[PDB]
Write a protein that binds this DNA or RNA. Structure first.
Lengths: 160, 157
DNA sequence: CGCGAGTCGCG
DNA sequence: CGCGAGTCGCG
């Protein structure tokens, strides 16, 4: 499983769903060649160039962090979503960055026991950290690149 | 993920690179988003949609599974795989070999400008067919997939 | 990872 | 004018 990339004073902590898809089977988050995370954050303006999975630690230099809401074991059901939410919230309470972005609607709905959640900014918070639900970048996410960039861009803008 | 081969097979489905969880359980086409099982059922090679765990059962339908080869590949690697592959097909020499990928066949078999469908090249008596990969990452629509496999199934009568 | 694309750059 | 190119971007 991939290691967290967290610290204090972060502007955003990007939270992935499952601990992997090989976008973790290299030790680097979002390493599967078909994952648009890196491209999206560059284009959304969180970074100045498209980092490479190998350069994941460099995210800190942009005051960005990466984590996942599940940590052990294809499927991925409520069982593990709520449990992960718990460990997750603790981490966010620890480093409490400006915003947490969950890369998945239904995953946030589950992991955080919310329902009928809509894309974007949530009202719920973890201490002062804001909670944002953004569409996952995976190549298996039928979301178009444009909708993706537009969604992340908004978060980036909002944090000014 | 281990081969599922034997003699007298009608078709040996050849995947490309079981990297995207397809072999993440030891089973073939194991990722929940892969349409292999659904496509072969709907194309008529089997009578029900098998589950990855039931892969060995393919033999009961005179079908076999194999592959060409830490997330992507190399030209050397594909030609190399073609070689080991052809040997296997020469061994069990089934009725037809279906390569699940255009560019993969073009490479692994050093062909170029290949079009979908039946190829003229053969391995002994085995026919060679290039069909669109079923992965959930393959932008091919389910219908085009079913129609493509169906043709192979029909042709083998 | 596998797919489409062949219009575009060149002598 | 005809020819060759398929790597490149995308979900």
């Amino acid at each position: 499983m991939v290691e967290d990339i967290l610290a204090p004073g972060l502007r955003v902590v990007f939270c992935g769903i499952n601990p992997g898809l090989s976008s973790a089977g290299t030790g680097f988050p979002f390493a599967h060649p078909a994952n648009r995370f890196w491209k999206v954050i560059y284009q959304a303006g969180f970074t100045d160039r498209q980092l490479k999975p190998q350069e994941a630690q460099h995210l800190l230099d942009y005051r960005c962090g990466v984590t996942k809401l599940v940590d052990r074991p294809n499927e991925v059901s409520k069982q593990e979503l709520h449990a992960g939410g718990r460990k997750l919230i603790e981490k966010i309470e620890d480093y409490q960055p400006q915003a947490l972005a969950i890369l998945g609607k239904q995953a946030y709905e589950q992991g955080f026991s919310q329902r009928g959640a809509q894309w974007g900014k949530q009202t719920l918070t973890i201490g002062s950290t804001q909670i944002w639900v953004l569409p996952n970048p995976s190549g298996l996410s039928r979301v178009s690149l444009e909708k993706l960039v537009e969604a992340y861009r908004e978060l980036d803008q909002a944090l000014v």
